[PDB]
Design a protein around this ligand. Structure first.
Ligand SMILES: *[C@@H]1O[C@H](CO)[C@@H](O)[C@H](O)[C@H]1NC(C)=O
Ligand SMILES: *[C@@H]1O[C@H](CO)[C@@H](O)[C@H](O)[C@H]1NC(C)=O
Ligand SMILES: *[C@@H]1O[C@H](CO)[C@@H](O)[C@H](O)[C@H]1NC(C)=O
Ligand SMILES: *[C@@H]1O[C@H](CO)[C@@H](O)[C@H](O)[C@H]1NC(C)=O
Ligand SMILES: *[C@@H]1O[C@H](CO)[C@@H](O)[C@H](O)[C@H]1NC(C)=O
Ligand SMILES: *[C@@H]1O[C@H](CO)[C@@H](O)[C@H](O)[C@H]1NC(C)=O
Ligand SMILES: *[C@@H]1O[C@H](CO)[C@@H](O)[C@H](O)[C@H]1NC(C)=O
Ligand SMILES: CC(=O)OCC[N+](C)(C)C
Ligand SMILES: CC(=O)OCC[N+](C)(C)C
Lengths: 135, 134, 286, 45, 96, 48, 93
């Protein structure tokens, strides 16, 4: 729709939204990020290599006050889908990974509510190192 | 540039990705990697001389001779060409007749015998030029 | 008058104020109907040990975009053009059961755009999916590996999938000689996830493949049977010959080797045991 | 005068309004004849 | 693109510089490492003679928009590097 | 028969042939449309 | 007023005329001191046959940029920021 395209252009307008800046408000505050790992499948557990491969969905939720809008002015739209690569993201990564791949596999869209709430649920194939007990 | 107009600066470092490069590559590579591995800076003198020394990990195809294994001697070659410009555009020249071993780490399994370099032209083509190190 | 001028003229008009981050519907309540279909090019690998299936498919997609419309009479009677797929909005159809592969389409060939807004996109893809492997009747086994496709961020109220055709196209399938597709049908499903309060549709394709049991019969079964035939001869061998122990020891050490060779083919799953594994083990015990 | 300046001018002219997404054919009915051939460098495996 | 690709790349990924002439002619000769599937016949192994094919064609342009012209029929071998394990009996391209 | 080595010889031949068949199996494709003549010869020899 | 606004103003000011291809020294005769260190994460492998060591390290680097200075009092007391490493000059270690 025209209204949705207008809203998307308005929100991500680089003249007013810089994705390199943390959405900190009220001063020197911190942004609370909620995590939730959803295990979709345990692909394999190599014992010789000591690597566990998993297919997980890494739920991530935070509040970005710079992506707020009034539903009345935008045809009562309550949430819109934005590309995750064009908004500020907390660079949450698998720190103990094996194979040296830290970020998610797909980079899906981020579902943004009108009140600034963000919801990002990217899938990922993760190869994590772990200590195998052979006794 | 004129050094006197730039605080008597004689040479500066410019990124090699933002200046014209002769696309010299390892033509006979065996893994599909033609270019160098780093793309470092190029040291540019005030007279326009460019000095580029990028490192590279190369995988060249070799004709292994097995008749005298394990007392065999291999003759592996590395052929360098510019995969963009022909001889009518750029002329390749050898800075030295042999490869340099100034910073070489001895192998332990293989003993280096000779590393000559030769510049080859094709008398029938006139657009072909390469430098091969044996 | 000319195409490379008219088509260029058309291309400029279409991508003047085009936004690729917005669902292409003239009305918010409308649904983007994506006709989804698969055309298998070949079955690259059916790895049983890793329980993964590698396939080469053409991910046929088709949807209507209301901004990419024009009147052919105005543009020298141009009815359709080829446009880059990275400049237009596309559905985010991902393979749910991806194992050691890419979730979405990563090649982005050109799309065919028709004057009424229809967009046909048929990118090729190599998908490495995970499928349960049942080797009870190996090498006469018949596997059933599935691929689940669906939109990742749009629910049924925004994007809905339509079965292009029930069966996976096989006109250009490449026969390998090891596997034969018995049937491959896509089934439309809808379900609710704990993530989100909306219904997310999906299309699951079930590839029922049958192995041709003449290689492993020639190379594993018959050699196994021949050794099993020597199991009983030790009892007809006279003791004075002094070769009884040599015969039965050799038989045991041969059957043991065959069991390990099979152990390296079948998956390490502990739900079912192959009939070949049972037979070898019982012969080893006897 | 130098060849480099002439080439820069030519490149500026050619790509002023060039659209790479459009088929390069003078006319609607035209077909892009793409001459195709393969040169084999080595049969790796 | 290569139709019968197997685990490799569908299209060229090196994208060298194209030679453009003043009459509009364009010559583009990039390199490629192709992994094409082919049926293996081992009836007479090790004295076998394989017949492996590579299928090339435009992915999105039909015959009414892009037509392929067979420059030469046989594959050019002037720069071929001898494998030492296989010998190319005959490599001919057929337009279909 | 008095040498007491017939069983050793024949068993060794059988297992050597089986090992060579298994070695061949690691080279040829796992296809069921054609069978190598080397494989057929080895299998007939093992049966006999 | 909000910290995000101050950070945006600071980012606009810093990269106004910044060049990432130039050594960040106020004087040519100066030398860029790059405090260098390693922090091994795991010794992935020690390949004896191929004679290679695979390690997972954090390449801790630290230098001084004279053109990336600001007064926190003028930017709502912003003391530090995180910027993509590809927007600034880096040592080519
Ligand atoms: C294109 O070709 C057709 C048929 O040859 C002709 O009728 C038409 O006038 C041509 N258009 C231009 C712009 O030359
Ligand atoms: C969108 O569709 C709904 C339901 O059909 C309708 O009530 C509404 O008026 C439509 N919007 C516009 C702008 O026509
Ligand atoms: C336009 O082209 C279609 C086929 O693409 C043809 O059937 C039709 O007659 C043409 N009309 C005109 C006015 O050229
Ligand atoms: C194949 O699997 C699917 C889902 O796992 C099932 O619905 C279908 O009945 C199976 N088909 C056969 C022939 O086993
Ligand atoms: C090789 O295969 C192609 C297509 O399968 C066929 O046209 C050709 O005749 C074959 N050549 C030989 C020598 O078998
Ligand atoms: C840079 O340092 C040198 C040596 O300390 C000094 O002579 C020169 O004046 C300095 N440059 C400036 C602009 O102060
Ligand atoms: C600025 O922040 C620092 C801590 O980051 C704090 O110690 C200091 O008091 C603050 N100053 C003002 C004026 O807010
Ligand atoms: C909203 C969103 O990203 O959902 C992802 C998970 N899925 C496909 C089960 C709904
Ligand atoms: C239009 C389009 O992309 O078609 C792709 C299918 N193929 C390669 C068989 C023509």
């Amino acid at each position: 729709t025209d209204t949705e395209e207008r809203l998307v252009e308005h929100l991500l307008d680089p003249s007013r939204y810089n994705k390199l800046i943390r959405p900190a408000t009220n001063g020197s505050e911190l942004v609370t990020v909620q995590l939730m790992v959803s295990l979709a499948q345990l692909i394999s557990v190599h014992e010789r290599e000591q690597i566990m491969t998993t297919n997980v969905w890494l739920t991530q939720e935070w509040e970005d006050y710079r992506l707020t809008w009034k539903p009345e002015e935008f045809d009562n739209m309550k949430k819109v889908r934005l590309p995750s690569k064009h908004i500020w993201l907390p660079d949450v990564v698998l720190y103990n990974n094996a194979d040296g791949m830290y970020e998610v596999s797909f980079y899906s869209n981020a579902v943004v509510s009108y009140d600034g709430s963000i919801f990002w649920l990217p899938p990922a194939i993760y190869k994590s190192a772990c200590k195998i007990e052979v006794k | 540039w004129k050094p006197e107009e730039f605080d008597n600066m004689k040479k500066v470092r410019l990124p090699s990705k933002h200046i014209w490069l002769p696309d010299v590559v390892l033509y006979n590579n065996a893994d599909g990697m033609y270019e160098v591995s780093f793309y470092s800076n190029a040291v540019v003198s005030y007279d326009g001389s460019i000095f580029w020394l990028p490192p590279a990990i190369y995988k060249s195809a070799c004709k292994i001779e097995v008749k005298h294994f394990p007392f065999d001697q291999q003759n592996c070659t590395m052929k360098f060409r510019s995969w963009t410009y022909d001889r009518t555009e750029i002329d390749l020249v050898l800075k030295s007749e042999v490869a340099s071993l100034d910073d070489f780490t001895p192998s332990g399994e293989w003993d280096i015998v000779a590393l000559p370099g030769r510049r080859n032209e094709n008398p029938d083509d006139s657009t072909y030029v390469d430098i091969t190190y044996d | 008058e000319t195409r490379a001028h008219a088509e260029e003229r058309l291309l400029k008009k279409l991508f003047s104020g085009y936004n690729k981050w917005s669902r292409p519907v003239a009305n918010i309540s409308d649904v983007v109907l994506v006709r989804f279909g698969l055309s298998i090019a070949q079955l690259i690998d059916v790895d049983e040990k890793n329980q993964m299936m590698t396939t080469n498919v053409w991910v046929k997609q088709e949807w209507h975009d209301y901004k990419l419309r024009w009147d052919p009479a105005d543009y020298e009677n141009v009815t359709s053009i080829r446009i880059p797929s990275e400049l237009i909005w596309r559905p985010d159809i991902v393979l749910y059961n991806n194992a050691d592969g890419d979730f979405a389409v990563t090649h982005l060939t050109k799309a065919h755009l028709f004057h009424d807004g229809r967009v046909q996109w048929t990118p090729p893809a190599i998908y490495k999916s995970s499928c349960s492997i049942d080797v009870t009747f190996f090498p006469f086994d018949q596997q059933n590996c599935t691929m689940k496709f669906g939109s990742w961020t749009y629910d049924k109220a925004k994007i809905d999938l339509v079965n292009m055709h029930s069966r996976v196209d096989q006109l250009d399938f490449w026969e390998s000689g090891e596997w034969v597709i018995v049937d491959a049908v896509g089934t439309y499903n809808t379900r609710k996830y704990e993530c989100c309060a909306e219904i997310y549709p999906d299309i699951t394709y079930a590839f029922v493949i049958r192995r041709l049991p003449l290689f492993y019969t020639i190379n594993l079964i018959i050699p196994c049977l021949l050794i099993s035939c020597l199991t009983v001869l030790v009892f007809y061998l006279p003791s004075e010959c002094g070769e009884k122990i040599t015969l039965c020891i050799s038989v045991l050490l041969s059957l043991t080797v065959f069991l390990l060779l099979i152990t390296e083919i079948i998956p390490s799953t502990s739900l079912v045991i192959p009939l070949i594994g049972e037979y070898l083990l019982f012969t080893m015990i006897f």
